[PDB]
Every structure is written in C-alpha cells, then in structure tokens.
Amino acid sequence: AIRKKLVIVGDGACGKTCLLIVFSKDQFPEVYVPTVFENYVADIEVDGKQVELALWDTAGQEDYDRLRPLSYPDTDVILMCFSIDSPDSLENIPEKWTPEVKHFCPNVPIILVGNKKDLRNDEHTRRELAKMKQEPVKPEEGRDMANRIGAFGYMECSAKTKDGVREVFEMATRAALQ
Amino acid sequence: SMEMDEKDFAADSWSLAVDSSFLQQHKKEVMKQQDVIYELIQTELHHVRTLKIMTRLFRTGMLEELHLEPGVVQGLFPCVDELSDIHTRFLSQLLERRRQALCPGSTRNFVIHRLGDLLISQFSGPSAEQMCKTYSEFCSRHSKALKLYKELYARDKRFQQFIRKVTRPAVLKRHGVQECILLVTQRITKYPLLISRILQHSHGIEEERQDLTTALGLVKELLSNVDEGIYQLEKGARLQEIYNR
Numbered sequence A: 001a002i003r004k005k006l007v008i009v010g011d012g013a014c015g016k017t018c019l020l021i022v023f024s025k026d027q028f029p030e031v032y033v034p035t036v037f038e039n040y041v042a043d044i045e046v047d048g049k050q051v052e053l054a055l056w057d058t059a060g061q062e063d064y065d066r067l068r069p070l071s072y073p074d075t076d077v078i079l080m081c082f083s084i085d086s087p088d089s090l091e092n093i094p095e096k097w098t099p100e101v102k103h104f105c106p107n108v109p110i111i112l113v114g115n116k117k118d119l120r121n122d123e124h125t126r127r128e129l130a131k132m133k134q135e136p137v138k139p140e141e142g143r144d145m146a147n148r149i150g151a152f153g154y155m156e157c158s159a160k161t162k163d164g165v166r167e168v169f170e171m172a173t174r175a176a177l178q
Numbered sequence B: 001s002m003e004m005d006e007k008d009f010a011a012d013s014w015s016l017a018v019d020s021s022f023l024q025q026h027k028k029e030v031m032k033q034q035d036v037i038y039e040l041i042q043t044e045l046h047h048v049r050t051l052k053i054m055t056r057l058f059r060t061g062m063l064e065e066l067h068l069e070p071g072v073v074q075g076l077f078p079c080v081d082e083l084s085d086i087h088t089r090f091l092s093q094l095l096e097r098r099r100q101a102l103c104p105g106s107t108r109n110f111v112i113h114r115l116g117d118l119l120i121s122q123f124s125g126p127s128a129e130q131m132c133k134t135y136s137e138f139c140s141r142h143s144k145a146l147k148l149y150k151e152l153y154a155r156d157k158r159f160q161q162f163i164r165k166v167t168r169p170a171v172l173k174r175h176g177v178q179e180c181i182l183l184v185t186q187r188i189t190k191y192p193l194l195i196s197r198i199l200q201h202s203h204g205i206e207e208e209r210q211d212l213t214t215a216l217g218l219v220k221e222l223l224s225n226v227d228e229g230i231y232q233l234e235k236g237a238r239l240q241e242i243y244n245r
C-alpha cells in the first residue's frame, strides 16, 4: 500500500476534530466524545487501490501562525472545513485559509467540506442565526466558494449522523493519488 | 508504556474505567469533569510513550546498529532527552495525584478534585521556562529533522532496512519518525483545549475554577512565547538568507 498524508484545516469549532474521530472509529462515540485527536493511519481501498492514509488535525493551532505550518510538510490532500451552522466560518475560507494552504502546500488538492449539514434543518440553529440576520449556509453558497478558491471539489457531511463521512475520506484518497 | 499504567488508561473514558457501582455514586457534572481529566492523563501517557519510541527505539537503535556520521542522530531527534525528562516528570505527578485519590481496596476507583494546582506548578517557574526553551528549539529544528530523515531513507540501504524493521509491527503503525516529530510539535497546542473543557465542568468549587483559569492563562503564555521564538533552521542556509528574513 502507498502512504499518503491528509491534513484538515478550518476555524475553531468548524467540526474538524469530530469529523476525524467519527471516521477513525467508524462511529459517533456513545459514551464520551474526545476533546482532541492525536493522529491515525487509515487503511482505505478506493477504486481498487490500497492506501495507508495518515490523518492530522490543526485544532489548537489556529492562533499560532509559526507553529501551525509545521503541520503542512509533505501533505498530499487538504480538507478545508467550515460549519454549515456558521456563515462566518465560510467567509474566512478565501482570504485566510486559502492563501495559507496555497503557500505551504503548492499544487496540493483542496476539498472544501461543509460540516454539520444536519443543522441546516435544526430549528434552534435557524432561530439563533436569524437574530444576526443570518441563515445556515446553502449548498450553492458552498459550491460557489469551492469553485472560487480553486478547490478540487465540494462535499458535505454530518459527523453526528455519519452521513457523507466515508465518502469524504474516499474522495480525499482519490485526490491524494492524482 | 508500562503495563500497570496502560491497563489503568485502557478504557475510552473515566466512566468506563471505574467500577459501575462507583460511577453510580457520583453526580453527572463530576463524571463529565473526570472524563476530561482522564483524557488529559491518557494523552499525556501516550505522549511520553511517543518520546520513548524516539529515544529508545529510533535514536538508541541507530547509535547501536548503524554507522551514521557524528551529529546526524542529534539532527534527526533534536531535544528528545530534555523533552522526555520534562514530560516523564509531569506524567509522574499526574499519575501520583490519581494514585493518592484511589479508594482503599481499589486500583481503579478515584476522583481528582484538585488538578488546577498541579497545572499551575507545571506551567510556571523553572519547569515552564525549560518547556519554553526546549519547544522553541525543537519546533525550530523540526523541518531540518524531516529533511535529514527523507535524505537518509532515500540514499542509505542500511538506514532504510533499519527503519522498515523497527516500524514493521502493527503497534508502530502511527509512529514512524516523521509522525513522532509532528505528534510532539502538536502536543503543546492540545493543552488549552483539554484545560478549557475541564474548566467548563469545574465550577462547583470556586478555588478549583480559579486555579484552572490561572493554569489556562499560563499555558497560553507558554504557547505565545514558543510561537514567537520559532525560526526554521535549514541545513546549508546562508547568512544573507537569514539576515534578509
């Protein structure tokens, strides 16, 4: 099997840690959801190809501009995350995360991922956002941002229900192989 | 790691590590607080284990089996002895706090009510100065270590055979040389996340809420100082490239 490296980036509370936990355990933990993610090496078989995909989180590094880039050497695929319940997490994608990733990871594919898709039809979320003249991120807003930033593609998932999680990592493996 | 500590931290949470008849005697808020303290100690035990893989399996294995040129092994594993001393001492204090809190007749039932004071001590005074100096040096030598590793693996047959041999076991799947270096660099930024969540469930005793708030501040001061003190070293860098930063 060939070895590839994946790193997930995004604002704090975009759900990147939870996404890595749910994928690596194949389950949303029923008893205790960990606070942090160390690393993991996933055995993935996609389109007949076997890959060892090493997974890394940048959670905790968002405020440290000289420590954070130490996560980037030899990355093969970037997952760039935002939360669908946070239109502000999407606004930081083009002028903060995208220029950073393009500088440290030139020519590395980026997959823009809209996390917490289950909150698009959550009434408490819609009420809270409506008080700030906002609404959950629409699918076309996510696709347009991915198109604008030069992303390899756009995907959505829910770590809470596991919907779409496997597909995100299978596509990330295919991108890493290209 | 040693078997005794591995078994004490084998469960996915504190609520699954203690006996169910002991768990039932506590309020939900206490269980939530202890689950996060358990995660801090468990991840610290794993971090010390990562440092032992670097010092004992890789570093000492290369010194004893290979004929690498002087200063090459130090370039691959910068500051590992110092980092091991800092974290092994910290882990010893965390495990002793847990052990003193065990109920008589039990090796698994405990509640840690006073973590804040231990964290203030770790993240203040000489131990905090040493953590700041050591991570500022380690993180500035991180990229050079990765490049030296890649060069040796691509060009030296005995080095490649050594690496493939010692990393073959399934228990080393997540712990190759490059993976250990990044696990160590990332350790320090996990502390505020764990401490903030412990603090969220430590309001019952005002002394404890205040101590954890002080500890969170000290950890952030350490991270700010380390972040400001980093400048990537590069093998063969010229003075002109350095002073034109």
Ligand SMILES: CNC(=O)c1ccc(S(N)(=O)=O)cc1
Binding pocket: A017, A018, A033, A034, A035, A036, B197
């Ligand atoms: C029901 N969900 C939780 O208890 C929970 C707890 C913690 C997280 S974290 N620290 O963001 O990864 C997420 C979810």
Ligand SMILES: CNC(=O)c1ccc(S(N)(=O)=O)cc1
Binding pocket: A043, A044, A045, A046, A166, A170
């Ligand atoms: C072939 N049947 C499967 O269920 C299956 C399930 C998961 C994978 S992957 N792409 O390694 O995560 C492959 C195959």
Ligand SMILES: CNC(=O)c1ccc(S(N)(=O)=O)cc1
Binding pocket: A066, A069, A070, A071, A072, A073, A074, A103, A104, A105, B139, B142, B143, B230, B231, B232, B233
């Ligand atoms: C202090 N920052 C570094 O040493 C560093 C950070 C990132 C890289 S990368 N992702 O290979 O371009 C190299 C070096």
Ligand SMILES: CNC(=O)c1ccc(S(N)(=O)=O)cc1
Binding pocket: B123, B124, B125, B126, B128, B129, B131, B132, B133, B218, B221, B222, B223, B225
């Ligand atoms: C009372 N404060 C201290 O003793 C202290 C000592 C050292 C640090 S450092 N060098 O950022 O990790 C912070 C705080």
